[PDB]
Design a protein around this ligand. Structure first.
Ligand code: FE
Ligand code: FE
Ligand code: FE
Ligand code: FE
Ligand code: O
Ligand code: O
Ligand code: O
Ligand code: O
Lengths: 170, 170, 170, 170, 170, 170, 170, 170, 170, 170, 170, 170
């Protein structure tokens, strides 16, 4: 592994997690009405776990000799995923579309990291796998709500419980 | 402060909390169907906290030299808010209207007490403020469900948790 | 079983529990002095459990096709027991007399329900039995304090612990 | 009591509980979309309690001299209730119909056991009563969701909490 | 019910529980060797629950107007079961025989009390039923160890957990 | 606000709390006999909370640039309240008189601090308000015991629980 | 140390603990009225700890090569202290006299064991010391209640907490 | 990876776990006598963890686009392992032989899934690895009991604790 | 109060909290060496509490009719405090200077909000007061470390414990 | 033992603990800067345990017929150790010297009590030993910090945990 | 006391505990089969407590001015007991013989330390006494299993619970 | 995989963990003074986790058919890493150098095992990975303290918490 290339992927992934934690706050607040009450805790589950994903990625970046960018504006510009902006018409189905594209991108970025660190950096692989477990579950929540495909997933007992990345958290 | 005038406000406020704890029991039970399952725990959250509000107001009444009325019928007639009766057509939106008017009146009565004890009775102000925190949150739950205005409030983890009046409880 | 006759008994029993929860609040507050400090937590134990008895009776009423009355004034008028009014002279022995009559009536009403649902409605029998366990223990607390007959009962570790009706509570 | 006749009733009841635990797994997973999210935890509550009912029935069968059948295929054929198959059109209301018939049959079988062991086998009566408490509550959940009749029941705090059969569990 | 006849049965039952708590202490200590290590916790489970049975029977005796005998020697003479004396040859199988006869007698005495208070004293019936649940489980433990008949019972998680008589304890 | 004048008030208030924690130790020990057993835990409740009041006041003194006096003898001389000395005849009613004057003085000193920091030092106001909540409750305990005036206050579950100043504690 | 002489002292001490656990049950139940409500939990504290003292003495008897007597009647006859019989007139002060003599004897017997195993059997000394800590505290509870001498002891948080003999318990 | 081939492997594996949860129930009940008491909790540990393995496999089947078979009879026929039938002579060693073959097959099937998803489906690999951790430990328990080969494994603190598949559970 | 002017202050305050949570992550990581190990948990305490301050401010913004800005870049530009950039020479004392200026500004912004909502918006005042409690404590930690002025403050037991804003959190 | 001479030693020891609890509060607050942050929790550990030592000594004084002095000024004058005054130059090494002399004196006074009650008053010996355990550990903390001699001791998990005197605390 | 002679005894005792923690690991793993499953947790109980004994002895060695040997080989050579080597024929009875001799030697060494520090070093005496409590219990476990002498000891609820040396642990 | 070659690696790795647990005990005790107080808990964190690594490696050795060596001297000679001897001049930086070389070697040995069991022994890979997670974190603690390179790692909440190898522990 070229460590610089892996450092870029991990920094971009952390930027994606950090901006997601802000943008899901707006998306949660606009999940109003009787329809939105059902999905509020699902958005809350994903948002707090995505904040935990930023908390697990940063220690690994500094173990590898990398650093967070000096300016937070530069951090936002580095996100591996497009901003989960609130839709021009914030209906429940339009918000769910935005959440689905945000979590499909997250599954893609952590699949990229796992495919790059497989058998070469076992710690980075295990961190990306732990997050990829939770990104896949986030994607299935929003896919079932939006499309109706049985995903077999239940709701978290507590928001931000993070069953897979907990061993990486303090 | 005229203590008699403040005792009247606190007794009428406690009567509002006590009758609400009965009338929300009826309202919870008629939140039936798929739509009502989402609001049942929100009604349960408010009803148990309103019961805690009665439990916190009564000790303050006796510290100030006041007493609860001898007869419970007289207590009911003294409620600062109109009875949250079940609507003639108990649809979910009609029930939500009743809950919204019940919590808007509760915000008004505790704003009246805070505006009256501000800088004169610091304990009575702090109790009324603690309840006013929860009444405002109750109103925002029902306003978001009925109208769809983003309120930013999440559901309680446990019903009757009462994060603001807990220090006044036993 | 005639369900209407059983619904009347259960509604009157719940009205008795609800008004007891209000009247024991007044009785607790007037158990003052050195004598009253000993019985305050005993009144508090009974009052909170009687509130739990109202919380367990209401779900059964709605399972049976019954409903709580629309107006809380009509609910109070339906109580199976006379109001536990504060005595004209609120001495400790006069308050204990009022508590004793309140809990002897409660044992009577739940014995009436058990004798009516024995072998016909096993759920209603089991609910009435669970409350009758606690009403009998409430009566023995006040009988020992007032008369001095050994009852063998200890004080609850926590008020409203409800060791018998807990399985019916949420 | 003819113990063989009671052993047949308990073995058929446990077969119903065991197959229900499998068939509710399929029903939970197809409760998709915005409507389904509301009932997923309700199906999850019933499925884990029905698994606890199998865990409590089996010890009693062996105390009475009975045994589970050697082959699991023979166990499935012995279920006291028709299989809760997924509907040909798995809409939310069609799934709710299947759940309603599954729990109405369970109330019937445990009423048959209680009516048979009343005053003759107190342990078998008490176990059947504890399960009948939970089957009645399961039926009222799905009856309220499908029809809108007020049932007065709240959601379990945790899935499979089993407030009534817990004393029979390990 | 003749209360005097029922008071005799409950006092004799409590005497059986109290002496069992002492005699099982001796039996536990002589369950030595590799064979006895397996049965030590099973004896300990039964002995601590039999102590809980004495703690639950005594309050009921005093509610009914009865009293424990003045002298503990008179209490021992009133035991409804023969003393679980240590065998002349304290082998594991001979000790198991003594434990089996002790628990078969206990099942008989509490079946006698249930058959006497069925539908006449609901509290006394419910207390005897709760103890009968645990005596039946105690008998099945020693029957499976001594004879090998499948009983379906698992060990208690903690000694003296008393899943059935806990609601009667303090 | 003149900070020196507020530092004097806070130092004198902390000296009152520190000496109270010693003098209530003596008062607790002389609450003997049957009458004194009821008030021992009430004295213990107040003494441990008064110790917590000293623990919350000292950090605020050092934030404002003040310091505790070098000598503990000088600290005692600065108490805002007269010493809660043991009465020459330590009867229960004489001890209660001493406790009542100690807590009436404490309400006065913290009402003085609140009246001085109202709208000018929000942190100092909030600390004095939190203690004033507990001083008022302490006064009501002893006023109810000594005079019999209904106060509406129940006993603390644990001594030194300090429901109002807990957020200021470590 | 003559082990036989020490085995006699420990067996007689355990017999005292066992009979005390029965006789304090009677004494607790007759601590009726308003006066007795204050001492009921104090008797309950001592009785459950004296039961723990029997639970800690028996293992030591078997480590030393001793055994409990075969017959429980022989065990009762070996008690180092006279039976704490209920007084002919069971007033609160007469019951307190019986409890005081019971605990003064217990302090004497464990001082005898400590004076005999000092510097020779460190385990037997440490067990007797742990019980002597609790017997001294039991004596001071009843001495303060009966005579009014300040003893400085507070009530246990939970009955039978046994702060000193806990390490010897299972 | 061909998803259809992987879906077949996971469905057959889930069928093995589900039937094992039933067949180990029979095997547990026939582990009687003094020898069987030692292995009862070991069978109980494996059976409850095998139930957890079914609960973890099903969500993955639905994420991958697969579904459980409509009929439970068809699910039983799909088990990747032969049924753990009770032996014709249910001795402890014959039962242990059945348990050993059941867990050796389970190690084989999850090794097959890991060898198929290695570096291609990281989530499916991680789920199969977590179960393979527990199947290997199950096999070592029964191998040590039957043959005596040192395996180094200790008993679970609680049945069904599932240290490796917990993150996949709800 | 002009609500728009108060919404601007609360949005700018929340932007300060959000950017602080990122910038303190960088500052924590460069608190290296032996000197920095002492301050790492102090920076961690402040950073997690500042994240809680953002979580408490956002719900209030939406109750008042305000919203978070659509773009996170716009949110960063609105921070009421200059960015806590890492110093060009990241020595411990240079880092402490940056932390001190960050928390002195935070005390100023929340003192501005309290001075604006004093007696007009009791909920907004109480939220700003709760944060001002923690900002003052954060400032005192860094002032004591950098300058040596006695502050009287101890370390948090757990990072992000937030003793003052906890009631505003979920 | 002359009880008066032992009462003097115990009263002087309690006065030392009480004044230490005040003087360590000042010493804690002046342990500022980067050097002082390391020793703040060590001073906090010792100060809260010394307060626990005062809480364990006082009950023993009243069991022995002694009493605390009427005036707190007289209590301070009786301290067995010189006041732990803040040094004229409050450097970290000068403060550590003051703490070392305070804890060397405490080890001396409790060694004096143990040498006086050895084999004569086992309860007083055990209390003094329990405190002497903690005083020795306090001395080793400050000796290692000041001089660098390996003491082998670790920091308390929680301040005032008091592992040795906890059995004497309520 | 000659501190050098006592330091040698404690270092040799710690060496015995450290090597025991390794040798019991081998002994645990060879306690295979049906017989060995009963004794596995008993060996595990002793081994984890012997590890705790090493953790408690080392701090005392450094308080007294002693140090652990530089090389671990030198530490092994200093063990006060012969190595608990696995028997040439690792049968259960041969393993039990090794465990019995290991714990008889440990009782001897701590009896030697207690007999040497009796009345001269109270902390060293109390530490050795706490370990001697557990060594005596360890010896009784293996003596009862090997010989069948009633020892009266029950199994630890959790391995390494260490009821007697816990106060010396961190 | 050649199992013998992997058994050698795991035995040498466990020998390294066992000796590290002893040598870090000496290193902890010599981390004296003000500088060493900061690193004492860091050494304690690593030492207790390295002890857990020995506890997780040993079961795997016995599953694979390997055994611990008979003699502990032979175990020490097999350590994969040189002994972490105390430096001739035990300064803080010299001790940190010894800790850094100890943990760099540990990262190397577990990287060797992971590189050898990748895709061939999934259980051995997962155990080595779990330890490698903690060895990497241990190395970064000592690298940041000695050199000052930002590592991003925080201190453990509790010593020996072992977030990664916990699932392999009992
Ligand atoms: Fe357990
Ligand atoms: Fe366990
Ligand atoms: Fe346990
Ligand atoms: Fe255990
Ligand atoms: O366990
Ligand atoms: O467990
Ligand atoms: O246990
Ligand atoms: O345990």
């Amino acid at each position: 592994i070229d460590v610089e290339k892996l450092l870029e992927l991990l920094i971009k992934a952390a930027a994606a997690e950090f901006t997601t934690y802000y943008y899901y706050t707006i998306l949660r607040n606009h999940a109003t009405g009787l329809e939105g009450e059902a999905i509020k805790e699902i958005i809350e589950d994903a948002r707090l776990e995505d904040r935990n994903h930023f908390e697990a990625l940063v220690p690994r970046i500094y173990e590898l000799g990398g650093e967070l960018p000096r300016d937070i504006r530069e951090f936002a510009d580095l996100a591996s995923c497009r901003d989960a902006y609130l839709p021009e018409e914030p209906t429940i189905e339009n918000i769910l579309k935005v959440l689905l594209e945000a979590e499909r991108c997250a599954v893609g970025v952590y699949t990229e990291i796992c495919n790059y660190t497989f058998g070469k950096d076992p710690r980075t692989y295990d961190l990306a796998l732990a997050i990829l477990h939770e990104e896949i579950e986030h994607e299935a929540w929003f896919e079932e709500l939006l499309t109706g495909k049985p995903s077999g997933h239940f709701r978290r007992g507590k928001p931000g419980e993070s069953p897979y990345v907990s061993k990486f958290l303090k």
